[PDB]
Design a protein around this ligand. Sequence first.
Ligand SMILES: OC[C@H]1O[C@H](O[C@H]2[C@H](O)[C@@H](O)[C@H](OCCCC3CCCCC3)O[C@@H]2CO)[C@H](O)[C@@H](O)[C@@H]1O
Ligand SMILES: OC[C@H]1O[C@H](O[C@H]2[C@H](O)[C@@H](O)[C@H](OCCCC3CCCCC3)O[C@@H]2CO)[C@H](O)[C@@H](O)[C@@H]1O
Ligand code: NI
Ligand code: NI
Ligand code: NI
Ligand code: NI
Ligand code: NI
Ligand code: NI
Ligand code: NI
Ligand code: NI
Ligand code: NI
Ligand code: NI
Ligand code: NI
Ligand code: NI
Ligand code: NI
Ligand code: NI
Ligand code: NI
Ligand code: NI
Ligand code: NI
Ligand code: NI
Ligand code: NI
Ligand code: NI
Ligand code: NI
Ligand code: NI
Lengths: 129, 132, 129, 132
Amino acid sequence: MQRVTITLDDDLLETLDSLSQRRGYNNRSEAIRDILRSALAQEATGTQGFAVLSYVYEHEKRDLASRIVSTQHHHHDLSVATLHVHINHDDCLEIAVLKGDMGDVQHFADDVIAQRGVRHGHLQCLPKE
Amino acid sequence: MQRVTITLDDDLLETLDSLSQRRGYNNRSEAIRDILRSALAQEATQQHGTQGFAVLSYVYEHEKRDLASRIVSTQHHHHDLSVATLHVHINHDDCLEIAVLKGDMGDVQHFADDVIAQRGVRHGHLQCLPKE
Amino acid sequence: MQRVTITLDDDLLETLDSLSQRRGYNNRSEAIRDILRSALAQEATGTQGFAVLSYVYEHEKRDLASRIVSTQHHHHDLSVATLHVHINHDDCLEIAVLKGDMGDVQHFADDVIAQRGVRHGHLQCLPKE
Amino acid sequence: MQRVTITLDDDLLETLDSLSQRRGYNNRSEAIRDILRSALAQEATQQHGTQGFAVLSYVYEHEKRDLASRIVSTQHHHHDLSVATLHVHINHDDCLEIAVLKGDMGDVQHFADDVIAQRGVRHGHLQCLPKE
Ligand SMILES: OC[C@H]1O[C@H](O[C@H]2[C@H](O)[C@@H](O)[C@H](OCCCC3CCCCC3)O[C@@H]2CO)[C@H](O)[C@@H](O)[C@@H]1O
Ligand SMILES: OC[C@H]1O[C@H](O[C@H]2[C@H](O)[C@@H](O)[C@H](OCCCC3CCCCC3)O[C@@H]2CO)[C@H](O)[C@@H](O)[C@@H]1O
Ligand code: NI
Ligand code: NI
Ligand code: NI
Ligand code: NI
Ligand code: NI
Ligand code: NI
Ligand code: NI
Ligand code: NI
Ligand code: NI
Ligand code: NI
Ligand code: NI
Ligand code: NI
Ligand code: NI
Ligand code: NI
Ligand code: NI
Ligand code: NI
Ligand code: NI
Ligand code: NI
Ligand code: NI
Ligand code: NI
Ligand code: NI
Ligand code: NI
């Protein structure tokens, strides 16, 4: 067993402690060691497949409604279908199911979320494997 | 029962006959009686004061005139009637969209119009399933 | 202008009259003439395109949940994606978006709705034209 | 601020290093600090007593063992948490499904488990967007 010293800010530690107590850990190291185990295990996650793109945006702002649909049409091949739920008067929750090469999928995601007016962008890839 | 006579013009009649022919009908009363029942029956499912769910389909060419931004804005104005919308990019220009609505079958009718009656939207189609 | 005499049962006429009065028609003929106009106009509705299949079914009954998904997988090519809303504890509202030759679409619809356990089956075809 | 020392075993560490390498990290505190914040932050969005919406994705092979009938039955048991589910037939065996949920972020967590924790379901993934 090796050792590693990290520096953490007060608020993070305050939440982490609140959690280590309740979740039944003897101390910070024990609790952090556990989060690492799960997190790294998820890193066991090739060129083609499907993907789920989630994100929230406001239809008005920079005419995003039109922009995001136009964008998706430029890559309509990669697009399978898009689910959309109106959450409030301004925001919209959208989920685009994508098919094709992961490279194209990665690019598609950027065209949609890496821009002003879009929040909570999330992309899960499901490669053929 | 009760017999009723309808006054039809030469044109409307030549129509009812070629289409009834194509659809296997050999008799006008039958062709007309079904069209009628089919109508009044759909007329029903739409009444106000009845709850339920509905399916609204339609195709639109996103570019035109902010139909995307206006179609989406219209659904937000009535967000309480919307459950979720499914959109499929048909080709570089056409958008197939399907919206599930729940609530008063009446208000739904309105909603279908506010959208289906928008310059640029075609193939509109509603289907109300009263909660029974 | 030609003439056509049809026979209608009491209840239908009772609804039709209630309607002709309120909707402002002078009589049955005037009201029926109007329904015909619209109905026949809709008959202006070739081999390929998309379609929307709607229907309601109860997940339990004859294991429909599994059957309808298995069915759709036999024709997964014609299937683009399927929306599903749980309406109550027993019934489900499902809408399948279909792509392909109308012939295949017509067949697909029968495999899904023309059977016990399924209600309100509806199919709108959108051919490439 | 505050410095903390973690006791790691040779294996967990060789892991954190090859994966941090692949991801461009050159320092362990940074690799670990982000993993941590990312975790506690997601831990948050899930609390009970907060409303909102969520996205639940997962893949399943419909045949297996009535996973179709059981997955769908489970969603009906909690129908109030469901908004709508989107299903895509990946291939002759795999079903990609996406369910939108709204309500207490807490109950949602449960729901994700009742399904994601079903023999035959893989690639499960939740994303809670607290109504703020
Ligand atoms: O688009 C990718 C995702 O990016 C962010 O989450 C990332 C976060 O930005 C990243 O820092 C973390 O990785 C933790 C950093 C640890 C690395 C991986 C393992 C080896 C060492 C570095 O993963 C999460 C998702 O799981 C967003 O919060 C999420 O909504 C989005 O979908
Ligand atoms: O699957 C096709 C549709 O079949 C039924 O509606 C049909 C009805 O069964 C038919 O009888 C009527 O046609 C009226 C009969 C008139 C014919 C057409 C014109 C020429 C003469 C005959 O159309 C409606 C739909 O529009 C169902 O109620 C509907 O949910 C379903 O989607
Ligand atoms: Ni050691
Ligand atoms: Ni193209
Ligand atoms: Ni919206
Ligand atoms: Ni409101
Ligand atoms: Ni691009
Ligand atoms: Ni996989
Ligand atoms: Ni009589
Ligand atoms: Ni589109
Ligand atoms: Ni309105
Ligand atoms: Ni119809
Ligand atoms: Ni019914
Ligand atoms: Ni005449
Ligand atoms: Ni095949
Ligand atoms: Ni259901
Ligand atoms: Ni209930
Ligand atoms: Ni078949
Ligand atoms: Ni057309
Ligand atoms: Ni300090
Ligand atoms: Ni499937
Ligand atoms: Ni439960
Ligand atoms: Ni995530
Ligand atoms: Ni937010």
